Structure 1
Amino acid sequence: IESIENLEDLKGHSVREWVSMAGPRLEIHHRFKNFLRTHVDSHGHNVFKERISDMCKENRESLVVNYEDLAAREHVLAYFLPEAPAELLQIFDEAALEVVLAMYPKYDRITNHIHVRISHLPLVEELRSLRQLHLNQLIRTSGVVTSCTGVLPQLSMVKYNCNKCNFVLGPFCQSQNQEVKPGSCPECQSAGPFEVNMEETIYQNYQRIRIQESPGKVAAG
């Protein structure tokens, strides 16, 4: 894959498919790795060396990136980030894992994924002002948390025992949209009462919160 000297020329694509295809994906990956490795603050201190070191000291599995720093240092990543946030956040997580395992080669024992979190995004929105124009875009809102579920286990990559034979169905990704139905067993074609393999299934923490407008920002009555 040749390095792409200009990510900015979409050449008629939209941002989502443009960053989904391999060339721009690798270019974004390398640009984010270089950003993490070489970004320095106003005093010349490498901020992300310190941040990754603190994260690995405390086993926290998550890396907060300042959007102001990203926009200042690497423009096109900040350009594509709010347009295709899921795709670029996946790529950023991969790149951050590469940098983290460069710094701490044994951190795979503690984690298998690094979550890149974005802070100080200028795209601030009021809850009353969210429209269909903001769909599938990275927004920033404010409010008071009024409800919280308990921390619940959710399927992320689920495996199913076949209802008759001993085969196990392949990894199916959970989507947040609907229940994943296994289909039919490829060994024998049965499609009966399948059951989750708890030991081979990968779970993730889930918590659904309800936020509302803060009572001092809502109008009286």
Structure 2
Amino acid sequence: LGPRTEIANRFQSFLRTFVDERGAYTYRDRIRRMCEQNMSSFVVSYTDLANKEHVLAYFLPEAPFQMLEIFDKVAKDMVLSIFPTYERVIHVRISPLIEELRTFRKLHLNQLVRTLGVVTATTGVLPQLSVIKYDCVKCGYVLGPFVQSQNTEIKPGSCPECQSTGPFSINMEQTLYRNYQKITLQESPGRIPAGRIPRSKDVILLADLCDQCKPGDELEVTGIYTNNYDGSLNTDQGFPVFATVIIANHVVVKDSKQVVQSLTDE
């Protein structure tokens, strides 16, 4: 793309130069904090993003997915250019303006979103994929497409193992995973609009955002609205069988049964 020319430059212009609060902005030290913490979850606040460039609100939600990848790549290009040392062993976060249950709608798909919920009983933890390797049946030479590939086919008879292998084989090895556990949603009995339909919806998290939830307990999420990959597509009954899926970017506590006072102390 063209405009991404500017974005990376504009990122790198702030992650270690733009500062509030009387110098040494955290981002210059946050990277290394998490690096020495082996943690890999660099966090941002949209407030400071807005303080830098409020143009960062409307070329974004044409596709909020590109914003996060474009940020992850600035990360990688900041990590090992400065810390090539620990390069043999990212995602980011944002966490600030509330929207409500049953207000996300038809129109709030796949954009800049900030959204809430509560936990209940759900499943365990499991892994997922990223990468395309399948071939070895004729010649089965090393070919190596150049990406970890999510849902991508070409399927030729010509492919570099003597441009052969129209028929097919499969690998069970050299195969990236990423843990994952499913949720169940709930909504609060404090913020009731009088007995409306009980909230539960398909919502999602991921590998690092895992192994922390507990039933009938709450956690505020950034969240962004999407739908199941294929909700019952065939010339069929008098309704499609559609649900809709949300997925977690940053998970931010709503309960805090522990110490509750962050930066009262007086």
Q: TM-score scaled by structure 2?
A: 0.62
Show the counterpart of 1:70: 49
Deviation at 1:165, TM superposition (A): 4.1
User: Which of 116, 123, 126 does residue 92 from structure 2 map onto?
Assistant: 116
TM-aligned CA deviation for residue 92 of structure 1: 0.9
* One-letter amino acid matched to 1:209: I
* Structural RMSD (CA): 2.5
Across the two proteins, how many residue pairs are aligned to each other? 189
Contact 1:159 1:168 in 2 (8 A): no
Runs of 5+ unmatched residues, structure 1 = 1-20
Q: Which residue of 2 aligns with 1:15?
A: none
Distance 1:182 1:102 in 2: 35
More helix, by proportion: 1
Alignment partner of 1:183 is 2:155: yes
CA 1:83–1:103 in structure 2 vs 1: closer, same or farther (change >3 Å)? same
Structure 2: tracts of 5 or more residues without a match? 196-266
SS of alignment partner, residue 158 of structure 1: coil
Residue 35 of structure 2 is aligned to residue 56 of structure 1: yes
Q: For residues 177 and 62 of structure 2, what CA distance do their matches in structure 1 show?
A: 29
> Which of 149, 165, 170 matches 1:195?
170
C-alpha distance in structure 2 between counterparts of 1:188 and 1:80, whole Å: 44
Q: 1:84 is matched by which residue type in structure 2?
A: A
Per mean C-alpha deviation after superposition, the further-off stretch among 98-107 and 163-172 is 163-172
Q: Secondary structure at the match of 2:188?
A: coil
**Letter of the structure 2 residue corresponding to residue 208 of structure 1:** K
- State how far apart, in whole Å, the 2-side matches of 1:52 and 1:172 are: 25
Deviation at 1:147, TM superposition (A): 4.5
Tell me the CA shift for residue 152 of structure 1: 1.7
Q: Deviations over 1:183-204 (max 9, x none)?
A: 3553324334x323422x2222
Aligned to 1:161: 135
1:174 to 150, 171, 184: 150
Q: Is the 8 A contact 2:137 2:165 kept in 1?
A: no
Specify the structure having the higher radius of gyration (Cα): 2
Shift of 1:72: 0.5
Q: Is the 8 A contact 1:159 1:196 kept in 2?
A: yes
Kindly indicate whether the alpha-carbon contact (under 8 Å) linking 2:117 and 2:185 is maintained by their aligned counterparts in 1.
yes
Distance in structure 2 (CA, Å) of the matches to 1:126 and 1:168: 52
The 3-state SS of whatever aligns with 1:140 is: coil
How many Å separate the matches in 2 of 1:182 and 1:206?
29
Range moving further from structure 2, 140-149 or 130-139? 140-149
Paired residue secondary structure (2:14): helix
The reply to whether residue 41 of structure 1 matches residue 20 of structure 2 is yes
For the residue of structure 1 that corresponds to 2:42, the secondary structure is strand
Q: Distance in 2 between matches of 1:212 and 1:148?
A: 11
| Preserved CA contact (<8 Å) 2:139 2:165 | no
**Alpha carbons 1:183, 1:191 under 8 Å: kept:** no
By how many angstroms is 1:172 displaced?
5.5
Conservation of the 8 A alpha-carbon contact between 1:151 and 1:207: yes
Whether 2:191 is the aligned partner of 1:217: answer yes
Give the 3 Å change call, closer, same or farther, for CA 86–213 of structure 1 in structure 2: same
Q: Which amino acid aligns with 1:198?
A: E
- The whole-number CA distance in structure 2 between the counterparts of 1:31 and 1:134 is 27
Tell me the distance in 2 between the aligned counterparts of 1:181 and 1:215: 48
Of residues 118, 125, 148, the one that matches 1:144 is 118
Letter in 1 for 2:14: F
Counterpart Cα distance in 1 of 2:17 and 2:122: 39
Listed one character per residue, the Cα deviations across residues 110-152 of structure 1 (whole Å, up to 9, x for unaligned) are 3xxx2121113x3x32231111211121211111122544332
